[PDB]
């Protein structure tokens, strides 16, 4: 019933999967042996009473997957469904898409098919990765293409950690991002922007932590994923499936790159002093300082906002928040979308992991919003790429792995088309 | 003073390995996801470990 298959590609995808899966196990009560039916979506029920995640971990490097295997969650994960190779892409899209990713994609697809045969109401796929690396970009692209050609029109969310405007781990990160943008456009119905600087600033200003890290950002991304997916698992006033916000969020096939904002994302120090009303939390959500994407909404107009509410939120409070946001002039909407809002309500309050910085809140709000402002990140990315490719930097590595030279030019043309489309859709009639 | 001997061998800075902070060699994953995990709970173990003492849990 109403299943959802998770595919975790690359190191970033595997870490995000670790965080989101401890969150899912804690939320549905999954515990190690010897220690509601809403868990059917993310877990498969053995007749023995055991519960197995519906997630394929897929990495070309033995490190992260073998480390999960050596960890405690080895009991949780099937010995298979946890596929690890021997050689990584090494920040090479060509290496991860043409040479190393080709020998493992068949096994990944076979395992995905066996996972899908256990589901009769599969809502869709959820691919977690970062296009900064090679296997996250190249192998992720290949797997998305194969899943698109195999599973037809099944919903396919992709939680992608795009490179941040200033902070970047690798020097070839713009290359990988621009190369993977083609697949992330063609074969990803909704792509969620999850860059690092915005999350860092958010958890610095709100959680009051001076040392945020990968674990913290992955716990936050897991909270966002659970908030998005809780509507089908738990009963609520206005439940939404995957396709329900699919339709309400994608106005054109080319325009689906969306940003997220989660609140009340606060620490326990301020949780029991602040009064987090529904209107207040909605205002904090729409504030530019409470968003997960480093992109000011004031640089564009919202095309379609989709709100997810968890907890004891009342639809009257929801409507009051919608009305006050519409009245406020600091939030601007595109002219041809007067409604512009699609909100759902769920009765399940957020589940807090032990030892996490997040504090328990009686209610929570999650964003999935298509806004014309998002063109800033693509502008930064191709402003990096054009000067990078001005005189053939880091191109021999990509060529030597079996890629033609014109792929970078084709990807630049695609990115220019995306930016032109984003500028055009916001144009007044 | 075994740590002292090791530090003397090393030219540059060297803290006592016997100190608990350095002795704990858990990763970020291990520290943040299984904070109270023991050595016996990991996949690979010394052959001297008795199977009766070990946790007979193989699923979640």
């Amino acid at each position: 019933m109403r299943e959802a298959i998770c595919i975790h590609i690359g190191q970033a995808g595997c870490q995000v999967g670790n965080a989101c899966w401890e969150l899912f196990c804690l939320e549905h009560g999954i515990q190690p042996d010897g220690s509601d039916d809403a868990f059917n979506t993310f877990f498969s029920e053995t007749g023995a009473g055991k519960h197995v995640p519906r997630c394929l971990f897929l990495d070309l490097e033995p490190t992260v997957v073998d480390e999960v295997r050596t960890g405690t969650y080895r009991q949780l994960f099937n010995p298979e469904q946890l596929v690890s190779g021997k050689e990584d892409a090494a920040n090479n899209y060509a290496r991860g898409h043409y040479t190393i990713g080709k020998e493992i994609v068949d096994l990944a697809l076979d395992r995905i098919r066996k996972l899908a045969d256990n589901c009769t109401g599969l809502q869709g796929f959820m691919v977690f990765h970062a296009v900064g690396g090679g296997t996250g970009s190249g192998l992720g692209a290949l797997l998305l293409e194969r899943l698109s050609v195999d599973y037809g029109k099944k919903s396919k969310l992709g939680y992608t950690v795009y490179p941040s405007p200033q902070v970047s781990t690798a020097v070839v990160e713009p290359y990988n991002c621009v190369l993977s943008t083609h697949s992330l456009l063609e074969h990803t119905d909704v792509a969620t922007m999850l860059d690092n600087e915005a999350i860092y600033d958010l958890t610095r200003r709100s959680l009051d932590i001076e040392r945020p890290s990968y674990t913290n950002v992955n716990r936050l991304i897991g909270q966002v994923v659970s908030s998005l997916t809780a509507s089908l698992r738990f009963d609520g006033a206005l439940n939404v499936d995957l396709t329900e916000f699919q339709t309400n969020l994608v106005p054109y096939p080319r325009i689906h790159f969306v940003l997220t904002s989660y609140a009340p994302v606060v620490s326990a120090e301020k949780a029991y002093h602040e009064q987090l009303s529904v209107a207040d939390i909605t205002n904090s959500v729409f504030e530019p300082a409470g968003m997960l994407t480093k992109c000011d909404p004031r640089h564009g107009k919202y095309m379609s906002c989709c709100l997810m509410y968890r907890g004891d939120v009342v639809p009257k409070d929801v409507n009051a928040a919608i009305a006050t946001i519409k009245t406020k002039r600091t939030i601007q909407f595109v002219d041809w979308c007067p409604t512009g809002f699609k909100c759902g309500i769920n009765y399940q309050p957020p589940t807090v992991v032990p030892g996490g910085d997040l504090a328990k809140v009686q209610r929570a709000v999650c964003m999935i919003a298509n806004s014309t402002a998002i063109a800033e990140v693509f502008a930064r990315i191709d402003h990096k790429f054009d000067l990078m490719y001005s005189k053939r930097a880091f191109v021999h590595w990509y060529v030597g792995e079996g890629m033609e030279e014109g792929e970078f030019s084709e990807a630049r043309e695609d990115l220019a088309a995306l930016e032109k489309d984003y500028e055009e859709v916001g144009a007044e009639s | 003073k075994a740590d002292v001997a090791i530090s003397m061998k090393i030219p540059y800075l060297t803290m006592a390995v016997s100190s608990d902070r350095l002795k704990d060699k858990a990763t970020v994953y291990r520290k943040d996801f299984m904070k109270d995990a023991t050595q016996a709970e990991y996949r690979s173990l010394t052959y001297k470990t008795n199977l009766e003492d070990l946790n007979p849990s193989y699923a979640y």
């Binding site: 042996d33 010897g34 220690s35 | 849990s57």
Partner: peptide, 10 residues
């Protein structure tokens, strides 16, 4: 059952 008892003890 003994495993459950030890886990409860923990």
């Amino acid at each position: 059952r003994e495993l459950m008892r030890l886990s409860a003890a923990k």
